[PDB]
Design a protein around this ligand. Structure first.
Ligand SMILES: [Co+2]
Ligand SMILES: [Co+2]
Ligand SMILES: [Fe+3]
Ligand SMILES: [Fe+3]
Lengths: 285, 285
């Protein structure tokens, strides 16, 4: 029992099985949903989430990792309801998703105070439940590594040091934020193999992608050009660093498009198993 | 019946009486409160809010204007509870409080779409209740008039044009954001006397303040130096543009400090009546 699951007992990382490493059941701006609820329909969101999870399970998915955190409208009680309706293994996370500055709350607060929020979610539970976080999610984009973005990165490293949970990032595939995320985390003492640098499948600069993977971190490739890059990377022997996902105010695309395209281009079932079973296993090990 | 009140029938602006034009019952970051509720105690916030309203009522306050909006954690149901417990006249508002960029929701959305949210709150009601907004609140600070800040300003003007409700702003007293807010609103066709440029009491550059007032807008002076500026402005004949308030993650300061200090420096009760009764009356007229 190493990985916490929403609405279930924890499981050993070795029993995670076929895993979708980056799927959002739902996403929204906390402030907009609180202030203008007329814009949203939770019943439709629920139905859509249940349907997508069921579709994934029909293709043999055992575990889904949902990296929705602050900024994207994480709601543990919604997640519970989805689990009860499907029986899926669902890993929730903690963290903060920002591109520029932190909410006003964080004005004049230390990196340690931010880290304590993450550790609270990991050790005590999320949003007043006993459902605990199994990873930390962070982001950077076009604005680059700002002061507040760097605070969040360093907070994530502190959380990892204390709890050992892995770190997932969102980066911009065109401005080296991904490489900077990796460097800052590793300088703080994070094991590179406990980092997934995501949203890279958007670039064709395979050298940039290979550089990240070479430094020991997983690369998130989350169409023909995207599949082309994916295949390119596979044939170059980067299967064991590749993690594929689909990633608001589908899941079948992997099974209806990506994997079919791969297999009819050589890649066997041992490669598919590596990307979807072995890679997640190591990440959470 | 022109001004909407939380939990009550609307009233004529002439019956507003002694008004505190800018008091926050409660404030918080929506995203932080949703994601880490352990940080907050709503029961303590409620008790504190009730106590402050009761203190104000003991000094003869009849109406309180609470400009908490998106970004600051507006909660109409909390506001209702306070009204039920005190019997205060409470004016709620709509709008958006940002310094740099808007939530992700607003990516690729028009000024008209933003305006429609404000108009929804004014015409239909707030957060799924029949409690309607009686003004629009906007902000700018150190970053100045950004692209998204300007969007919100122009949305506020559209709302005012359609519904006639007045506009309250937060500005930085040291970078001319207040003057720019006023200019942009007036160019869009907003009557200058339907604008309150706030958070000016922080500067001693009385010429800057006088410039705003001269252009026909109310000036929000929201200690000795602050009172000094206030007195300075009063003796220069700017009483009829002055609005005073106290303005998170007291109300008596006005009655225990400011007003006492004023009166023992000449200003009579007709000036006090102008600032706290006549100025609000015109603003909402
Ligand atoms: Co992302
Ligand atoms: Co303000
Ligand atoms: Fe994502
Ligand atoms: Fe305020």
């Amino acid at each position: 029992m190493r990985i916490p699951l929403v609405g279930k007992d924890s499981i050993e990382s070795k029993d995670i099985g076929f895993t979708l490493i980056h799927e959002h059941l739902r996403g929204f701006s906390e402030a907009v949903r609180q202030q203008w609820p007329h814009l949203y329909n939770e019943d439709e969101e629920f139905r859509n989430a249940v349907n997508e999870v069921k579709r994934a399970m029909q293709f043999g998915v055992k575990t889904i990792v949902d990296p929705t955190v602050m900024g994207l409208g994480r709601d543990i009680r919604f997640m519970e309801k989805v689990v009860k309706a499907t029986g899926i293994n669902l890993v929730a996370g903690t963290g903060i998703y920002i591109y520029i500055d932190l909410p006003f709350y964080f004005l004049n607060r230390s990196i340690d105070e931010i880290a304590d929020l993450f550790i609270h979610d990991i050790k005590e539970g999320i949003q007043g439940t006993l459902n605990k976080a199994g990873f930390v999610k962070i982001a950077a984009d076009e604005p680059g590594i700002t002061k507040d973005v760097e605070k969040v990165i360093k907070a994530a490293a502190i959380a990892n040091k204390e709890t050992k949970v892995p770190i997932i990032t969102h980066s911009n595939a065109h401005n080296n934020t991904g490489l900077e995320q990796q460097r800052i985390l590793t300088e703080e003492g994070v094991d590179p193999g406990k980092i997934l640098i995501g949203h890279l499948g958007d670039t064709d600069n395979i050298d940039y992608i290979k550089k990240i993977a070479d430094k020991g971190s997983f690369i998130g490739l989350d169409v023909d050009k995207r599949n082309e890059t994916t295949l390119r990377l596979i044939k170059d022997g980067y299967s064991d660093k590749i993690m594929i996902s689909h990633d608001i105010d589908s899941t079948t695309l992997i099974f209806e498009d990506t994997i079919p395209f791969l297999k009819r281009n050589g890649v066997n079932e041992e490669v598919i198993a590596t990307i979807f079973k072995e890679n997640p296993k190591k990440f959470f090990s």
